[PDB]
Amino acid sequence: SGFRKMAFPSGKVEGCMVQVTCGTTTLNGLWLDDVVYCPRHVICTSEDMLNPNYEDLLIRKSNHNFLVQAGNVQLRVIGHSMQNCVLKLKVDTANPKTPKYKFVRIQPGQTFSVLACYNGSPSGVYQCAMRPNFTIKGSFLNGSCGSVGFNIDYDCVSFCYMHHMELPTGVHAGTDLEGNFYGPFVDRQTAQAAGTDTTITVNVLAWLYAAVINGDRWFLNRFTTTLNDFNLVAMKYNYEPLTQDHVDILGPLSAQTGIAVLDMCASLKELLQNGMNGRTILGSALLEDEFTPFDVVRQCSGVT
Ligand X SMILES: O=C(Cc1cccc(Cl)c1)Nc1cncc2ccccc12
Per CB under 8 A, residues contacting a second copy are 1-12, 14-15, 115-119, 121-126, 128, 137-141, 143, 166, 170-172, 214-215, 275-276, 278, 280, 283-286, 298-304
SS3 3: coil
Site string for ligand X, 142-171 (x = CB under 6 A): x-xx------------------xxx-----
* Other residues' Cβ atoms within 10 Å of the Cβ of residue 285: 10
**How would DSSP label each residue in 202-252?**
HHHHHHHHHHHHTT--TT--S----HHHHHHHHHHTTBPPP-HHHHHHTHH
Report if residue 54 touches ligand X, rule: CB under 6 A.
no
Q: Which does 301 bind (CB under 5 to 8 A by kind): ligand X, a second copy, none?
A: a second copy
Spatial contact of 249 and 272, defined as CB atoms under 8 Å apart: no
List the one residue out of 187, 186, 185 whose CA is nearest residue 195: 185
Q: Which is nearer to ligand X, 143 or 202 (CB)?
A: 143
Report if residue 187 touches ligand X, rule: CB under 6 A.
yes
Report if residue 189 touches ligand X, rule: CB under 6 A.
yes
Phi and psi at residue 202, in whole multiples of 5°?
-60, -30
Catalytic option among 145, 172, 246, 265: 145
By residue count, the chain amounts to 304
Instruction: Please confirm, yes or no, whether 44 is among the known catalytic residues.
Output: no
Q: What is the 3-state secondary structure (H, E, C) of 145-200?
A: CCCEEEEEECCEEEEEEEEEEECCCCCEEEECCCCCECCCCCCCCCCCCCCCCCEC
Q: Which is nearer to ligand X, 131 or 164 (CB)?
A: 164
Q: Which stretch binds ligand X (CB under 6 A): 61-69, 97-105, 137-145, 241-249?
A: 137-145
Q: How far apart are the C-alpha atoms of 109 and 74, rounded to whole Å?
A: 38
Spatial contact of 85 and 177, defined as CB atoms under 8 Å apart: no
Report if residue 134 touches ligand X, rule: CB under 6 A.
no
- For residue 85, the minimal CB distance to ligand X (Å) is 7
Q: How far apart are the C-alpha atoms of 79 and 63, rounded to whole Å?
A: 6
Q: Which does 121 bind (CB under 5 to 8 A by kind): a second copy, ligand X, none?
A: a second copy
Q: Which stretch binds ligand X (CB under 6 A): 6-14, 110-118, 181-189, 197-205?
A: 181-189
Report if residue 123 touches ligand X, rule: CB under 6 A.
no
Q: How far apart are the C-alpha atoms of 106 and 30, rounded to whole Å?
A: 18
Instruction: Please confirm, yes or no, whether 164 is among the known catalytic residues.
Output: no
Report if residue 49 touches ligand X, rule: CB under 6 A.
yes
- For residue 65, the minimal CB distance to ligand X (Å) is 19
Q: What angle do CA 107, 239, 237 make, to 5 degrees?
A: 160
Q: Which is nearer to ligand X, 93 or 121 (CB)?
A: 121
Q: Which is nearer to ligand X, 278 or 302 (CB)?
A: 302
Q: How far apart are the C-alpha atoms of 100 and 97, rounded to whole Å?
A: 10
Q: Which is nearer to a second copy, 68 or 247 (CB)?
A: 68
- For residue 41, the minimal CB distance to ligand X (Å) is 5
Residues that bind ligand X (CB under 6 A): 1, 41, 49, 140-142, 144-145, 164-166, 187-189
Provide the annotated active-site residues: 41, 145
